[PDB]
Amino acid sequence: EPTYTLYATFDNIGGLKARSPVSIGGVVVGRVADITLDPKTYLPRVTLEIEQRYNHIPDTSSLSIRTSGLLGEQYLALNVGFEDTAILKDGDTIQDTKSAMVLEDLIGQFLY
């Protein structure tokens, strides 16, 4: 499958790494190609490669970083948004992101 490039910035990518999958409905449609840290914002930017056969994904789509079972690996959940506006293609950015949970933040929540 040829792929098209997508970019996304998160506050915290956590356990996500190069080769991590991109799922829709839990089906893998692509892969984290590279992770790097903005020289200026010190915020991580993910580069995605999405199989071409999933070409009709809207800009209103989002990404969440998630885990696969309890001790699972980290993956990216692409949530397909409503169409009315455009469609993503090599070089487009996903605006709407949700950062990995931080186990220590949940323990501090769950206690305090």
User: Under the rule (CB under 8 A), what is the footprint of a copy of itself?
Assistant: 10-16, 24-27, 29, 35-37, 39-40, 42-44, 53-54, 56-57, 64, 66-72, 77, 80, 99-104, 106-107, 109-111
- Between 34 and 90, name the residue whose CB sits nearer to a copy of itself: 34
**To the nearest whole angstrom, how small is the minimum distance from the Cβ of residue 68 to a copy of itself?**
6
3-state secondary structure of 4: strand
3-state secondary structure of 32: strand
Strand partners, 62: 79, 96
**To the nearest whole angstrom, how small is the minimum distance from the Cβ of residue 91 to a copy of itself?**
21
- Between 59 and 80, name the residue whose CB sits nearer to a copy of itself: 80
Enumerate helices (H) and strands (E) in the chain, giving the number of each: 1, 8
Q: How far apart are CA 24 and CA 5, in angstroms?
A: 16
